[model samples]
Target: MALMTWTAAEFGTNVGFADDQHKTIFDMVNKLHDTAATGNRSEIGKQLDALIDYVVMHFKSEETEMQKKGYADFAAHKAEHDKLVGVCADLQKKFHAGEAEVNQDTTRFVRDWFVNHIPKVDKLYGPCLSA
Candidate 1:
């Protein structure tokens, strides 16, 4: 699939690996948004599962990069990812079980989380990037 670039306003910390992972995250969010906006409940549910799965993957990859960089806040960073992952997973599970409320709330939550958190917590590790 064709993915979009990160805009200047979206730039966070420069850590190359972290930034790359976040870019993938942004793509997944776009996918989620596009699919969810279709308003097909079934499609939205499937996209949500895919979105949460990719996010978990991206978070792990970025967390590993943080660890390799010997980042002091790696634990805290991983914890945040873990907490969000749990929430996303819960929403996905409920969605699969026919919970419409879970679908709407999680869709909005995931979109908000990606747009806001990436530049904040994720960007802080920018200095860790090498050329």
Candidate 2:
């Protein structure tokens, strides 16, 4: 599979259930990016809820699969998720207090992170589909 350039491409490889969940996430990222770009606090807040919930769901699902399959690098894979959380944590903190300084960089970092991580980790699950 070729690399996913946009979040839209990220949806194309998803399994059915994962696809439904992924839509909310893709939308969140886009919504957040646009909201940040426009400085829309309400939209940014809404997208924040959606993004956080969807990510928890997505990561839980992935982790469940890894646990079931005894994936050797499960802990290491999860560490990557933690790294993202750590980097983004401060931005979320500032943003909730209405700081716009972190807006642009947050969105850019999110876009870049998704574009990179999807191609790398997503491909791993594609070929190993259990069912």
Candidate 3:
């Protein structure tokens, strides 16, 4: 079974680019979960890489908006993005080294991060970005 799903109404940021990128990320994440559930270890590696790549790109977009808008919390927001990137990179490394598996724990982490970050962190920028 898929571990999580994405709904635009629930996740949308009112910023078009960010919303589109998020939807893409959501698709990749769901794909990863589905692939993992099927016990296809080999495919999980590729999906994980794709998800990480898009996530980094999305972070770049958000950071760019924050920078351009002179957001007060730029550094802190970036730090969060950096931390998530680091975590994802570590997980990717572990998966490549055959030390980690894309299981419920992994999916839950990704799911929860998006679930919280979008509404809480990302929406914090909506006022500036939407203007």
Ranking by lDDT: 3, 1, 2
Which model scores highest in TM-score?
3
Off by over 4 Å in 1: 1-5, 101-105
Candidate 3 residue-wise lDDT, 27-80, digit = tens: 888888778777788898889898999999999999998999998788898998
- What does the lDDT read for residue 36 in candidate 3? 75
Per-residue lDDT value at 89 in model 2: 63
RMSD of each: 3.3, 4.2, 1.5
Off by over 4 Å in 2: 1-14, 98-102
Q: Tens digits of per-residue lDDT for model 2 on 1-131?
A: 11122444554445555555655566677767766677567877777766766776787887787768777667877787778776666666776787745365666677677666666765566545444
Best-to-worst order by TM-score is 3, 1, 2
Give the worst 10-residue stretch by lDDT in candidate 3. Answer: 1-10
Better of 1 and 2 by TM-score: 1
At residue 49, candidate 1 shows an lDDT of 73
Residue-wise lDDT of candidate 1 within 1-131, one digit each (tens)? 42334765686565666666677777776666666656687777666677677778888787777798798789998888999988877766677777644333445676677666777787777666443
Name the TM-score of candidate 3: 0.92
